[PDB]
From Swiss-Prot, chain A:
Organism: Mycoplasma pneumoniae (strain ATCC 29342 / M129 / Subtype 1)
UniProt keyword annotations, A-Z: Ribonucleoprotein, Ribosomal protein, RNA-binding, rRNA-binding
Protein known as: Large ribosomal subunit protein bL9
GO cellular component, one term: ribosome
Gene this chain is encoded by: rplI
PANTHER family: 50S RIBOSOMAL PROTEIN L9
S-S bridge residues: none
One GO MF term: structural constituent of ribosome
Swiss-Prot record, chain B:
Gene Ontology cellular component annotations, sorted alphabetically: ribonucleoprotein complex; ribosome
GO molecular function, one term: structural constituent of ribosome
Pfam families for this protein: Ribosomal_L28
Protein name per its UniProtKB record: Large ribosomal subunit protein bL28
Keyword Hydrolase recorded: no
Keyword Ribonucleoprotein found: yes
Protein family membership: Belongs to the bacterial ribosomal protein bL28 family.
Keywords, alphabetical: Ribonucleoprotein, Ribosomal protein
Residue numbers spanned by region Disordered: 1-20
HAMAP family the UniProt entry points to: Ribosomal_bL28
UniProt organism field: Mycoplasma pneumoniae (strain ATCC 29342 / M129 / Subtype 1)
Domain of life of the native organism: Bacteria
Gene name of the encoded protein: rpmB
Gene Ontology biological process terms from the UniProt entry: translation
Amino acid sequence: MKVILKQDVSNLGKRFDVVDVKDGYAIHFLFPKKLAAPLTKKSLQDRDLFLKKQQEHYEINKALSHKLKEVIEQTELHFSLKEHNGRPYGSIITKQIINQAHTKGMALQKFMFKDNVRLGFGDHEITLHIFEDTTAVLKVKVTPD
Amino acid sequence: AKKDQLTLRGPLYGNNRSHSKTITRRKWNVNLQPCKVKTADGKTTRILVSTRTLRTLKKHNRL
RNA sequence: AAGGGUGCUUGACUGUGAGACAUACAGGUCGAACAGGUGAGAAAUCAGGUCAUAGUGAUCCGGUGGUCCAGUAUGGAAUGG
RNA sequence: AUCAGGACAUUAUCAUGUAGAGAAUAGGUAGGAGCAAUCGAUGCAAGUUCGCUAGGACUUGUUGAUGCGAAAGGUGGAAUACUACCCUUGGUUGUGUGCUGUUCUAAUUGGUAACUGUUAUCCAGUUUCAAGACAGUGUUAGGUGGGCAGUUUGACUGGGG
RNA sequence: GGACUGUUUAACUAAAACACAACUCUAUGCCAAACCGUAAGGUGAUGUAUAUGGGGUGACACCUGCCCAGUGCUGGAAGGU
RNA sequence: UGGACCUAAGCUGAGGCUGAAAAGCGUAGGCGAUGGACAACAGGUUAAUAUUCCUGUACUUACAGUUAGACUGAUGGAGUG
RNA sequence: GGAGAUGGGGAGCUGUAGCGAAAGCGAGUUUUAAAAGAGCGUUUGUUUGUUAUUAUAGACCCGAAACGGGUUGAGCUAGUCAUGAGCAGGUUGAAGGUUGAGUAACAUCAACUGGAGGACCGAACCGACUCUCGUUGAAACGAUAGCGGAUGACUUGUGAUU
RNA sequence: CCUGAGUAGCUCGGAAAACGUUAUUUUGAGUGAAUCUGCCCAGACCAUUGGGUAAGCCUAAAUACUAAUUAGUGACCGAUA
RNA sequence: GGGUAGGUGGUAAGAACCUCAGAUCCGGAGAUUUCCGAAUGGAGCAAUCCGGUAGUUGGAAACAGCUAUCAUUAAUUGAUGAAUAAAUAGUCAAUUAAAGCAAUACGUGGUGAAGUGAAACAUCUCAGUAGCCACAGGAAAAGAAAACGAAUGUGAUUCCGUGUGUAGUGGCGAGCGAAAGCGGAACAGGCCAAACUUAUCAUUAGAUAGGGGUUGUAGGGCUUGCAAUGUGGACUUGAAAA
């Protein structure tokens, strides 16, 4: 229940400081990526510790983003669909790609995928806005059968 | 009954008066809403939360 | 004459009040006499609404002015009498 | 949450005021008889705005030392510039707000559909779909509400009403 | 008089009462509308407007005149509250 | 005639849901004949009953061994019922 | 303390001065300017036992249809649900279909099938339309004699619910 | 450095308090302080003054009654009681 | 153990019994204790049926005897474990609890009517009456000043008279009833979390176990000393005694 953003910038840029007015659940507690800590420390004495924490989170975010981009662009995803004699009858949902990511040893959470559901067969490439500056692009092949 | 799934607070049953001050048996039901919680060792499904407890869990970070 | 008009005005006062009236009560009726301070007329004395007998509903409750009155430990205030 | 417009208001912004006369376009509080000068004149097209139907506050294209008839000249019940205060109207940088119309879901609803529990019309978890700040729910306070609850419907009466 | 096959007030009474196929009208587009309860839940309905609920009349032949003053019902957004 | 064989309306109800409390709802589930399936007839006896006692005539579903033969086969699927 | 009188325990109550609502005053108080008047005053005892009355507790007592909460109740009976059974006997001979004539095809007609009808009579059965009898009857609802329905909205059994 | 926070007060209705909602305690909905020079109480409220230190827990003691067992008792009735 | 000479409960004189080598009876201590019954394997229409398992036995086997085990819920623990990789949920397994009944008596908490009166009645009254549900107890609750209260007042609470029908409250109507104090029975105050610190939680724990600490005649944590060699409990079993 803090008053400071936590490592994810909201709508059109607000700086990293004590500015998030608390409606209670509007977008602050709506996003599960926010801080849960006492308030007496989080006025000025814990500000430097929070800056160090934000730097650590930024660097690990960059490292993990690069790792995921590398392992995604080296290992493209594969599924299969039932075809209407050349027309795509099967359906593909983001649940399937989330499951594949989770099985491949790199869990992707439920709070970064905001794209529409995919409908179609053949090779697809989608640039997923998981990150603002270091986003990734995924390639998927669905076998027609 | 119509009580929240976090604490125990019985609904209020008492007497209400009219413009002529007529004693009538009236009821007040506690303000409960369905809310989702997340914590260790399961117990993450939707429960019933009172607003009085909702504010406390909001500031105390019960998720 | 208690009537007509003329004149001074406003006792169509304040505090009462012995004594009576007739009645379950609530009540209601007259009223000597005194104190103050008045009007009338020189004073005398009168004036406690009309010539009298009909011409209204308590008690709360709430409201207004003033009050030698009280004022939840003290002062006020508030709340009151 | 977000998008847009309008408003209710105002910091700041300038314009904005003619009875008859005053040789003039006069709203009330004043020191007040000088001051405008690259805070560059007068003349030349006039505009933002006012608009009474006559012009005004300022100005740019030009301009280069002109003057001000509104100090002073005199006027009216109100008399002039330099400037301290304040009224009518129009705008008006700026915010506080809700309201009108909306976009999105991640809150939330579901007797959309699917998977597992479970070889189960329920239910549990998950996904999907339609919605989506609404509905429902809680309270407060309205409007409506003989479906229901409680009661009331006086007395004398030369029979009762 | 009512169309009738019929329902009947056990233990006073069967019709000119009710009933009926039918006719008429209103409301209802799915968590239908309505109803039970408080709520889960449940019928309607494992239904979809040629259907359902409710209102009125009651084979068939022919007609159902006027009036929205008042009440209701609906629509209405200007103005007063 | 029945149960150990099976259900209809129905009953209860782990869970679970709702509900001031007791409690109500309802799923898998388990019960629930008035039915379905299911293999006995003739005669005789006793104060008293009897296709149950007896006589003769029968049959079925069961278990094990044995002989002989064959690839059989559900807690599932279909027909049947 | 034989659960005794009692002893102890004086906490409180009466009267001992009152006036009023009071600041307070005081054999005076309040009303009033009043020392005017008026009112109230101007000590006249306490505790028990007893009787009667009165007050609340059911309070001389008997008496109702009352009201509220809880509870058993579908086997009487109403309706519904799943599931058997039954309707004798006698009548009528629809629609429909067939054949032929017929008509351009139809339609129509004559003969045939056919057994249908909230069709008819009338046992069982169901209900009770009427006269008499009885009305402390045999019976807290019946008896002879007749009655209607009596193939369908027909009756009824079983078990279950409200 | 510390002294019990969605805490107290407050608003809309209440309940308990002699109490009909009034100081005092509490809540169905909302609300949001204090840090010991604190904060609360002193039948609204303030200043002054005095008293007090909650919002965590526990605590036999006196007191109500004998369905039941034991010993004894009754100015209790003596089989229409 | 006491413990004696007749006894074998009663409609039964009896018959058959046994008996002073010490019965019976009485009092303790046990065992036994068919079935139903919260009922607990499933059901059931109460004292009934059908049962599952692990063994024992007759038998070639079925079958049939003999035992014990076999409800649900909550907590703990371990394992398996889908949607969903993992983990969960769920499933299985093992351990522990009340689970129920009854004294019309209470006590606590919750729910929650009426008529009576006002010679009417709605506010009110009886009344949080009765009643219903849950709880535990033989006693319970209430209990330590955010107490009272207006006095150089007291210093847990509970209960009895008094205060007192006082001050008052209520269509100021019916009605309703104090708060202190006094006389009394009895009269113990304690235990936690926090700042502060130690060891353990991938020691980001913001948790675990410790020293400390229960505050207004303010006190504790903090830095820093002298002391004090104990008392009472709200309190452990051993031994004896009465």
